Design an enzyme around this catalytic site. Structure first.
Site, PDB file in Angstrom:
ATOM      1  N   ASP A 247       0.894  -1.645  -0.068  1.00 41.70           N
ATOM      2  CA  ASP A 247      -0.167  -0.114   0.335  1.00 41.70           C
ATOM      3  C   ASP A 247       0.458   1.493   0.016  1.00 41.70           C
ATOM      4  OD1 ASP A 247      -1.990   2.397   0.285  1.00 41.70           O
ATOM      5  OD2 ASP A 247      -1.840   1.166   2.240  1.00 41.70           O
TER       6      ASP A 247
ATOM      7  N   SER B  56      -0.597  15.661 -12.133  1.00 39.73           N
ATOM      8  CA  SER B  56      -0.739  14.598 -13.767  1.00 39.73           C
ATOM      9  C   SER B  56      -1.308  15.998 -14.755  1.00 39.73           C
ATOM     10  CB  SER B  56      -2.117  13.998 -13.639  1.00 39.73           C
ATOM     11  OG  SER B  56      -2.259  14.205 -15.128  1.00 39.73           O
TER      12      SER B  56
END
Ligand code: U1H
EC number: 3.4.23.22
Length: 330
Positions: free
Chosen positions: A35, A199
């Site tokens: 994780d 992004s």
């Protein structure tokens, strides 16, 4: 030194991935969920409430000659989906794919939420975010990656998650045969303890690329892709009959529909998620409504590039003094 381990989807929908990890002496092998969105290594153990264990493999510190109770230390964690667990802390030897760390904090669960109990395939979590998020008190503990950093050939690990297929976690080296083209690196902010990046935009199907900054985290521990409401609405508008359902808690679509791809930007590069990756199947057995893999982050407060996005790429987690994230097509 280096390490390499195969990671395997737990079910036919790629809801999560498990990786075998050796804990203790002699080795006790547990299947952990790697994780990159959390920073605790916690396991089902012989100390877990017996009613809260349903088929998991348990870590037994009393059978490990290298286990040491970390006197007075406790941990308590709550995940973004409402899951929770807590217990005490041992130190022990931990090995991932041949890479061994001694004195790693192994957090033994005394209490686990029902979400973990009903998932017999996951024996625990191995956190790979930054150590500032570790919940051990009063003495915060380091992650497996942080402890291994010194002995690694390079301070990197890579995630190569498969679509309905096994994949690979590598530690300390970049497998240049696992991707195509070049790796595009992008800056990481550690201010919140996450692998947080920006992004550069998105496109739906064969549509025009929309240049816009999307701040989000790279999280192998989250199944879906959670993006701002404007982006998610633009995607599902291209799917005939798709709608946001309050009773289901997200966008659903007619299972007969074909889904368009989704492209996200990394610097000047583009990563294309095939439409099939966004299909998470019927909301209930026999239903003709299917659940979408791209959902709104509005209720969460942070954008999450989960497994749906990461499994479309070869991903480099560069833990150098200035951390960066690398993305390549594969
Ligand atoms: N995969 C771990 C994880 C889960 C939830 C969150 C949230 F909700 F805080 F963004 C971060 C990290």
């Amino acid at each position: 030194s280096t390490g390499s381990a195969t990671t395997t989807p737990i079910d036919s929908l790629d809801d999560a991935y498990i990786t075998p990890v050796q804990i203790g002496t002699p080795a006790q092998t547990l299947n952990l969920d790697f994780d990159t969105g959390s920073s605790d290594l916690w396991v089902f153990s012989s100390e877990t409430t017996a009613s809260e264990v349903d088929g998991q493999t348990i870590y037994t510190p009393s059978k490990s000659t290298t286990a040491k109770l970390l006197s007075g230390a406790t941990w308590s964690i709550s995940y973004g989906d409402g899951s929770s667990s807590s217990g005490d802390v041992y130190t022990d030897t931990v090995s991932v794919g041949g890479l061994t760390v001694t004195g790693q904090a192994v957090e033994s669960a005394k209490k686990v939420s029902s979400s973990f109990t009903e998932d017999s395939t996951i024996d625990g979590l191995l956190g790979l975010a930054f150590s500032t998020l570790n919940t051990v008190s009063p003495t915060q503990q380091k992650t497996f990656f942080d402890n291994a950093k010194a002995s690694l050939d390079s301070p990197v690990f890579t995630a190569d998650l498969g679509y309905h297929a096994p994949g690979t976690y590598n530690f300390g080296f970049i497998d240049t045969t696992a991707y195509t083209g070049s790796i595009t690196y992008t800056a990481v902010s550690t201010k919140q303890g996450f692998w947080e990046w920006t992004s550069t935009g998105y496109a739906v199907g064969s549509g025009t690329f929309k240049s816009t900054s999307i701040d989000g985290i790279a999280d192998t521990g989250t199944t879906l892709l959670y993006l701002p409401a404007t982006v998610v609405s633009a995607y599902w508008a291209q799917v005939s009959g798709a709608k946001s359902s309050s009773s289901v808690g997200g966008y659903v679509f007619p299972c007969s529909a074909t889904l368009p791809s989704f492209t996200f930007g990394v610097g000047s590069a583009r990563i294309v998620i095939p439409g099939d990756y966004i299909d998470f199947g019927p909301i209930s057995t026999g239903s003709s409504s299917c659940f979408g893999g791209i959902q709104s982050s509005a209720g969460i407060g942070i954008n999450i590039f989960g497994d749906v996005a990461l499994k479309a790429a070869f991903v480099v987690f560069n833990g150098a003094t200035t951390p960066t994230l690398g993305f390549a097509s594969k």
